[PDB]
Amino acid sequence: FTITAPKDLYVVEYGSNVTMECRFPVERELDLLALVVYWEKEDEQVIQFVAGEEDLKPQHSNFRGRASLPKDQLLKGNAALQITDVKLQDAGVYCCIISYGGADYKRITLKVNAPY
């Protein structure tokens, strides 16, 4: 079991949206109840999807209502993190962690260009 992140780094503009791919193999048919997904950013949880239960942790989360896991991508084996209305603070090293049978992780860097 190994996850593939084709893009190692993403460069985006302040105020825009970004979707960071994180793909895992589905042999035959997907059992959401066996799937665990965490996205972190430098020892800070962005979002999690654990056996069908999603938690944004918007308890003073820095991504209160801007982070999501589109389920049309989850079902295709892509645990993509979508961040809307990006801010400078969002730049950094993200970690995508998946457990589906086995477990693996990939680091992904986000760069945010500011206005002039």
Author numbering: 19 to 134
Copy out sentences from the published article reporting this entry, exactly as the authors wrote them.
Programmed cell death receptor 1 (PD-1, CD279), together with its ligand, PD-L1 (CD274, B7-H1), constitutes one of the most important immune checkpoints as therapeutic targets (Azuma et al., 2008; Francisco et al., 2009; Zhang et al., 2009). Immune checkpoint receptors play a crucial role in maintaining physiological T cell homeostasis, but also constitute a major factor in the escape of tumor cells from immune surveillance. Here, we disclose the first structure of the mouse (m) PD-L1 and analyze its similarity to the human (h) PD-L1. Our study indicates that while the amino acid sequence is well conserved between the hPD-L1 and mPD-L1 and overall structures are almost identical, crucial differences determine the interaction with anti-PD-L1 agents, that cannot be easily predicted in silico.
To fill this gap, we crystallized the N-terminal PD-1-binding domain of the mPD-L1 protein (amino acids 19-134). The obtained crystal diffracted to the 2.5 Å resolution and contained 10 protein molecules in the asymmetric unit. Similarly to the human PD-L1, the mouse protein shows the immunoglobulin-variable type topology with canonical two layers of antiparallel β-sheets (ABED and GFCC’C″). Protein chains are well visible in electron density except for the two variable loops: BC (Val44-Leu47) and C”D (Leu74-Ser79). However, a detailed sequence and structure comparison within the hPD-1/hPD-L1 interaction surface demonstrates a similar arrangement of Phe19, Ala121, Asp122, Tyr123, Lys124, and Arg125 between human and mouse PD-L1. The most significant spatial rearrangement of the key amino acid within this region is a dislocation of the Tyr56 sidechain in the mPD-L1 structure compared to the hPD-L1 structure, resulting in ∼7 Å displacement of its terminal hydroxylic group. In addition, three amino acids involved in the formation of the hPD-1/hPD-L1 complex (Ile54, Arg113, and Met115) are changed in the mPD-L1 sequence to Val54, Cys113, and Ile115, respectively.
